[PDB]
Design a protein around this nucleic acid. Structure first.
Ligand SMILES: [Zn+2]
Lengths: 71, 125, 116, 121, 94, 61
RNA sequence: AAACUUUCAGCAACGGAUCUCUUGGCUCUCGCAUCGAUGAAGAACGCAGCGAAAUGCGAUACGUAAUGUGAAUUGAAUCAUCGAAUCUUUGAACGCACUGCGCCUUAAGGCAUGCCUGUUUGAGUGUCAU
RNA sequence: GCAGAUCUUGGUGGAAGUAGC
RNA sequence: AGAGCAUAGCUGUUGGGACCCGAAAGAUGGUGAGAACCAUCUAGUAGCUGGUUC
RNA sequence: UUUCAAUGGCCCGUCUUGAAACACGGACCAAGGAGUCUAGCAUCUAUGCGAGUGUUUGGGUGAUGAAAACCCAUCCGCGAA
RNA sequence: UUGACCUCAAAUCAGGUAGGACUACGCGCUGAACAAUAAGCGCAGGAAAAGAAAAUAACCAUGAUUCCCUCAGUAACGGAGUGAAGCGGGAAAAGCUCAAAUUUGAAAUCUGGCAACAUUUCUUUUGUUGUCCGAGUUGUAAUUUCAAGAAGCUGCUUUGAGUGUAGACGAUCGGUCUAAGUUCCUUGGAACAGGACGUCAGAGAGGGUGAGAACCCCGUCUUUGGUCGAUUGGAUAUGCCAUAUAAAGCGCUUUCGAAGAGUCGAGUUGUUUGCAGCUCUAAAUGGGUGGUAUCAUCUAAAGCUAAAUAUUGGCGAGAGACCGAUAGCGAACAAGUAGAGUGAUCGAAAGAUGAAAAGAACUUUGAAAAGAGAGUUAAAUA
């Protein structure tokens, strides 16, 4: 078992000896990504998760991110 | 013909909108025509169906049957009417659903909201 | 790499709406500025008269319009071009003067302090 | 259930043990229901959960409004009281400093503004 | 098809529909009140300028104009003065 | 009905069908034991539960 | 003869073609401009209905408030709108390791790094004035 | 517009209730 | 004492993956531990092989 | 249509070479499956106009579907002088 | 000893900012095979970049940039191939800011703290006024940018970075307003079909409903608009203030007129004339680039800038002579899922009962799975 669970992506691709994930490059700040891996990119890009905040941003754009309360 | 480009005549999009509507939209989707007496007295052609409404079945096998609306099953676009049922194998009476457009309202379940709605659609109470 | 033109009718309509949107913002004044009349710079076309960029400072001075107010009434200024012949000077001074003959300039409000 | 509109018409420390009593009630009812309960039991679980949610909403809204009043017309306020539109929107030039002009530009627009005119055909 | 678009399809949340699609619609006039009062919201901007007695362009037009009906010396330029020009229509007179 | 996946909805049907058979079998086995213990119960069930036929449920004229 | 073999036909299996369908794809066009240290994208763990190999939500856990619509789900809502609140552990991830191990102040507040403007406290055999 | 491409996908045969476990 | 220009169809021909299919290049970027493995350039190819529908 | 009698009658496709033969491909059935699109050039034919010819880069315009149809200012391509 | 200044520091001091993600379309640094390509790396926005000539030309001259058509598959390079540009026609048009000259009869300039006063898409946002400190003379304002301009003189024409109110015209968001058969006969499980008689149409789009529905329902047309919520655009009109002892344009000159250096350029090496390294290194009617083979044109080594343009991503929308479940996205359903691999990665198959579950009660055989009598349905040859 040369790989364990990654603290960032949660996959069993964290090389124990090198302490580097082969999926996301943890603990590097920039997530691992390659343009030749188009299929790999679409498997973990924006949209494959909750987008809990991004949906809120899209919802609030129409009224202009307004605040306050109605009269 | 439609001329607004804000309304789609696509069958794919119209079927998707009807069969994926929320319950607020489904409330207006299941509307029934008022009877002639109610039509000339409330100045309204049709209204959304509500529980305890007194209706008459106009089409289908149960044509002519009267009764109150016991429940408005919005998840199936069906109406449940009192004593309009079907016998099962074990003897229990399974209620029969009738589309809201196939019934006519003969007596309204008037409340404060319905009266305001009536005068909202140009209707004298 | 192929450049298709399926948006050719769409671009025609989009530019027309920009003209109407501009005219909605500036209601009574033309959607274009007045361009001078110049001669193309070659022996093949020097007999043609086409539209220039703006009027030279010597053209504006002769017609009576200062270069600071010319832009305010829709008269472009070309500091680069010059009048090498008296014909170009006369062709474009008259163009300015005819423009000023057909121009209604609406007055603006001015602040007049009460004291001196 | 409880009405939100008359819940805001109560004192702050009154809402404290009302939340406390509601929390023990939910915990006690859950202890009752895990040993056997009817379908109505989970109905009052739903109502008491929303009632606790309504209770905590009033406490947080009242505290938030108090903080806003205490920090009114103060140069620096906590981040939770500050606006949250978009990181870029917060970094942008404000309309006041967007409209700042030099005295050279002020004189140009004071004496030679873009006139309103029309061309007769 | 995109995972973002698949994500919002699988959701039970409604889409942020906006209805702004109405072509053939021309911008309404603000600015001059006299122009707005006499403007024809159906006619094009060239047809409205011509009807109002105004010039939509002080230069040439870069195509053919619409024909709806079958119609039936430096001293004397820098020193001459042109006495304005007549107002063809009532709108220009206002 | 609720499941628009063909494989899942027939997996759910097979699960429910097996559950229905088990409870019916248990009720039948326990009914046989009590009716064996008291033959009068078997007489009551047979007399009361006569299978229906179209001749028996023919509309009245 | 019978059997077997073969052929043909009927019925029954097997199989899933054809036809018809279609809340899907694909393509074109049009409008718009909106992520993040005020913690994003992504990951994990929970919640409650479940059929999840789906969805929604975050210990206020199908969400709460407000504006509605107005009687269901299958002031109601597994509803719409949406300006207020809440939003677990993570992750650029930030007290150190990566859940332990810590520090300071009053369970809470906190405690990453670089850089910019300012504030305060110091040092210098720095240059000068007394 | 198919009979072939040691064609692609799926379905089904004889071998054969044989080799065998 | 000009006969051309434009469009359409047909046929031929030259390029584009160019009738379909069939040999490994090589290079770039990674994974695992010299060699191996993965993904894109790349429809890089077969002077040929097989097939090519009333 | 099944069968019988009399007469005849080889297994197709490819490749080979003189035709072969031979060697290749073919267990069966269904579905899918191979000269296409585009840019040039030349030929022929049709059509419009003709010493001319070509509206659609673009502008105008299109009240109901407006990516269509309709109209053409200045250039320009080819041809001819 | 103290103080001023400089320098080095420190602080859980106050106030800010950077990282990461997405990259269809920007712009950079790179870089193979075979193309200035893929891949790698860096940086952005709603567009980016470019941009107001150290530009063309040789004419009767043009006049920032960008994009389209044309030039033109031309010149040129090198026969093949590579392959522009000036002109011309269109789309859109908008211009400017500094450095370099003394405010010198007055640092006229700015950040921050504190205190009041307002203001808000907003108790969340923005400022204003006062005071103190700091920045700054090793230079912050006004003035000037070569198209000029400064300083004088001159008599013409000009002038608000203010704050209210009202109405109108626009934009956005959320409510609200809506014509006419379910009449008769026949078939059918069902009428939405057929036949008869009607009705409405600025509505005969589409969808739903037990079979082909303008009139049963949602809608569609009116709507390129009436009527209410709230937000905000530019103007108009009218008050109240207006620090004008001020600030501008155009006349005139017996007075002046600053213009960007390890840069241009020269030599030599690579990449591709550009760029870069290296050695050297300027000028003031100078310098750059062209036509002469003297003339023409431009004014670099500092900066900003909307529109026309691009857009496989994102937020929506409308379509289609497209595909119709071995097709069309890998994915019409569970789909980047199940599953495979230490991992990078790879990756499916799988749609349809009926109008309605009315999903087969009950009796009976069997250990059970199930069978058989029955029963539902218009049909279980659903
Ligand atoms: Zn990882």
């Amino acid at each position: 078992k040369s790989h364990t669970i990654c603290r960032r992506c949660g996959k069993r691709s964290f090389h124990i000896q090198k302490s580097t994930c082969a999926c996301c490059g943890y603990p590097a700040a920039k997530t691992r990504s390659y343009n030749w891996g188009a299929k790999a990119k679409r498997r973990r890009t924006t949209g494959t998760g909750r987008m809990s905040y991004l949906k809120k941003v899209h919802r609030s754009f129409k009224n202009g991110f307004r605040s306050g309360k109605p009269a | 013909m439609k001329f607004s480009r804000d309304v789609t005549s696509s069958r794919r999009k119209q079927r998707k909108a009807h069969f994926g509507a929320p319950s607020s939209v489904r409330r207006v989707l299941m509307s029934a025509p008022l009877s002639k007496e109610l039509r000339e007295q409330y100045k309204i052609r049709s209204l959304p169906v509500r529980r305890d409404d007194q209706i008459t079945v106009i089409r289908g096998s149960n044509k002519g049957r009267e009764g109150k609306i016991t429940s408005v099953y919005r998840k199936k676009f069906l109406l449940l009417i009192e004593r309009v049922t079907r016998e099962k194998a074990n003897g229990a009476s399974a209620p029969v659903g009738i589309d809201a457009s196939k019934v006519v309202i003969t007596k309204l379940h008037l409340d404060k909201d319905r009266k305001d709605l009536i005068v909202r659609k140009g209707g004298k109470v | 790499y192929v450049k298709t033109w399926f948006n050719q009718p769409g671009r025609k309509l989009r530019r027309r709406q920009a003209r109407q949107t501009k005219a909605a913002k500036i209601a009574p004044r033309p959607v274009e500025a007045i361009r001078p009349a110049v001669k193309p710079p070659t022996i093949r076309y020097n007999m043609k008269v086409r539209a220039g960029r703006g009027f030279t400072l010597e053209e504006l001075k002769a017609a009576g319009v200062s270069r600071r107010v010319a832009s305010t009434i829709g008269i472009p200024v070309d500091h680069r071009r010059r009048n090498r012949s008296e014909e170009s000077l006369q062709r474009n001074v008259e163009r300015i003067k005819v423009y000023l003959a057909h121009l209604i300039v609406f007055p603006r409000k001015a602040g007049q302090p009460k004291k001196g | 259930a409880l009405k939100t509109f008359e819940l805001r018409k109560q004192s702050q420390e009154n809402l404290a043990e009302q939340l406390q009593e509601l929390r023990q009630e939910l915990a006690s009812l859950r202890v009752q229901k895990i040993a056997g309960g009817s379908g109505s039991k989970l109905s009052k679980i739903k109502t008491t959960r929303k009632d606790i949610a309504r209770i905590l909403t009033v406490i947080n809204e009242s505290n938030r409004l108090a903080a806003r009043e205490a920090y009114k017309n103060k140069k620096y306020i906590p981040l939770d009281l500050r606006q949250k539109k978009t990181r870029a929107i917060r970094r942008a030039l404000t309309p006041y400093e967007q409209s700042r002009k030099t005295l050279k530009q002020i004189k140009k627009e004071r004496y030679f503004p873009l006139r309103k005119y029309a061309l007769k055909a | 098809a995109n995972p973002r678009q698949r994500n919002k399809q699988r959701s039970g949340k409604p889409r942020l529909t906006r209805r702004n699609a109405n072509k053939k619609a021309k911008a309404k006039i603000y600015g001059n009140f006299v122009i707005q009062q006499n403007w024809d919201k159906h006619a094009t901007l060239r047809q409205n300028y011509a009807r109002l007695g105004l010039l939509a362009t002080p230069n040439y037009v870069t195509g053919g104009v619409e024909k709806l009906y079958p119609d039936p010396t430096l001293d004397d330029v820098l020193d001459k003065e042109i006495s304005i020009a007549p107002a063809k229509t009532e709108v220009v007179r206002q | 009905g609720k499941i628009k996946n063909k494989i899942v909805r027939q997996q759910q049907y097979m699960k429910a069908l097996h559950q229905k058979n088990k409870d019916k079998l248990e009720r039948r086995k326990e009914r046989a034991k009590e009716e064996e213990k008291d033959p009068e119960k078997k007489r009551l069930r047979l007399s009361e539960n006569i299978p229906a036929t179209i001749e028996s449920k023919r509309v009245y004229d």
